[PDB]
Symmetry: C2
Subunit: 120 residues, 2 copies
């Protein structure tokens, strides 16, 4: 992988662990593993983590930031979207579908924009 | 790869292109390729992109967010760090070094996005 890891800030570690456990579970990842004020979601080719921000201030999303997780099929993209929505996330404007790629976009409980992407 | 792609928001695409060209070139990642109001940095396992935010509002960086680029050695992590400082980025703390075993070099890009290069021996 190009990326060793990606971290996002969260305001409530348990609420976000519940979200990402469900979300990333649809892709075969997780559940999250605690390490200090973080949960890590690890695999042979990448690590994702959620953290309390080190500066002690509220976590926020970055406008223009998107984190894309690879999915093995369009069905996994759909399942990712449904699971995130049912467990604290919110839908983006674009419904899951093909883009001239298959993509499903969501925001996590803190507004971090995420995406499952499948290329057939 | 777990990640298909990562985008960050930037407020000046050409300024950021010149930073990331320099920075990611040290890891062997070829220069940015235009596509709409974005530049993409593709490899065989993952794509990184810099973008003007699609909502037309200013780019910001999220408190708690860190993006890590894989590097093949500690020397590459240091070359990354140097290129970053030479081209508009700022160092964070701590300075580059080993940490429990990993080598890490941290920067902020010209927009305040927090990034690092990481090597695991």
């Amino acid at each position: 992988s190009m990326f060793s890891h990606v971290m996002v800030g969260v305001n409530d570690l348990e609420v976000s662990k519940k979200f990402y456990d469900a979300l990333l579970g649809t892709l075969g990842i997780g559940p999250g593993v605690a390490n200090k004020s973080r949960y890590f979601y690890r695999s042979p080719a990448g690590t994702f983590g959620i953290t309390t921000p080190i500066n002690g201030q509220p976590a926020t999303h970055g406008n223009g930031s998107t984190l894309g997780f690879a999915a093995q099929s369009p069905e996994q993209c759909d399942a990712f979207h449904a699971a995130g929505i049912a467990n604290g996330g919110t839908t983006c404007e674009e419904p899951p579908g093909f883009r001239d790629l298959y993509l499903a976009y969501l925001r996590d409980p803190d507004g971090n924009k995420i995406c499952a992407l499948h290329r057939p």
